[PDB]
C-alpha cells in the first residue's frame, strides 16, 4: 500500500548515523512537500477620497476608506451611480 | 490604554470554518473584515450573530 518509510542507517564518514524518509508514491511526496512559492505582499490600499492609508472597506462598494466623511462621500457617489445607471 | 473595534454585527459568513468574513457597522461607518481560524472559533464560541453590538480587542 501507499507507505512512508523511515530509515536510519550507519554509514562510514569511523561510522556516522544518517536518516532517510522514503515515500512510496509521488502523491504523498507532493502532499507533504507542496514546494509552495513565497507569498506576495498585498498592495497597501489607499482611500480615493482623502489619500490617507486605507483602514476600512465598505462592503457594498468594496472601496477602501479611512474617514467617516470619506464613507459618506463614497455612499453618496454610489447613490448617484444608482440613480444614473439604474 | 487599549485599541478596540466597536460596532454592530451586520453579517457573519463562514465558509467550509477555515475562513470567513465579518461585517461591522456604526452610525457613520461600515467595513468588512477577513477572519482567521482563532477569530472564527472565538466568534462561534460566543454565538455572535447579526444585530449584536460587540467590541473586539485588537491586541488579544
Amino acid at each position: 500500500g501507499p507507505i512512508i518509510t523511515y530509515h536510519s542507517v550507519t554509514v562510514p564518514l569511523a561510522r556516522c548515523s544518517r536518516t532517510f524518509i522514503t515515500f512510496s508514491d509521488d502523491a504523498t511526496f507532493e502532499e507533504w512537500f507542496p514546494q509552495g512559492r513565497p507569498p506576495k505582499v498585498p498592495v497597501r490600499e489607499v482611500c480615493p477620497v482623502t489619500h490617507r492609508p486605507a483602514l476600512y472597506r465598505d462592503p457594498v462598494t468594496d472601496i477602501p476608506y479611512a474617514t467617516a466623511r470619506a464613507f459618506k462621500i463614497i455612499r453618496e457617489a454610489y447613490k448617484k451611480y444608482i440613480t444614473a445607471h439604474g | 490604554e487599549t485599541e478596540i473595534i466597536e460596532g454592530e454585527v451586520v453579517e457573519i459568513q463562514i465558509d467550509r470554518s477555515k475562513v470567513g468574513k465579518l461585517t461591522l457597522k456604526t452610525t457613520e461607518m461600515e467595513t468588512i473584515y477577513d477572519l482567521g481560524t482563532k477569530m472564527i472559533e472565538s466568534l462561534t464560541k460566543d454565538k455572535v450573530q447579526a444585530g449584536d453590538v460587540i467590541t473586539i480587542d485588537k491586541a488579544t
Binding site: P59, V60, T61, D62, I63, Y78, Y81 | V10, V53
Partner: peptide, 27 residues
C-alpha cells in the same frame, strides 16, 4: 452614552421595516 430611550424604542417599533440591504458591487 448608548442606553436606549423609550422614544427611540417606540420610533423603531412603529417605523416600517428597513429597506433590504443592497447587494455588493465591485467598485
Amino acid at each position: 452614552r448608548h442606553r436606549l430611550s423609550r422614544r427611540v424604542l417606540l420610533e423603531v417599533a412603529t417605523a416600517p421595516d428597513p429597506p433590504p440591504r443592497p447587494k455588493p458591487v465591485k467598485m
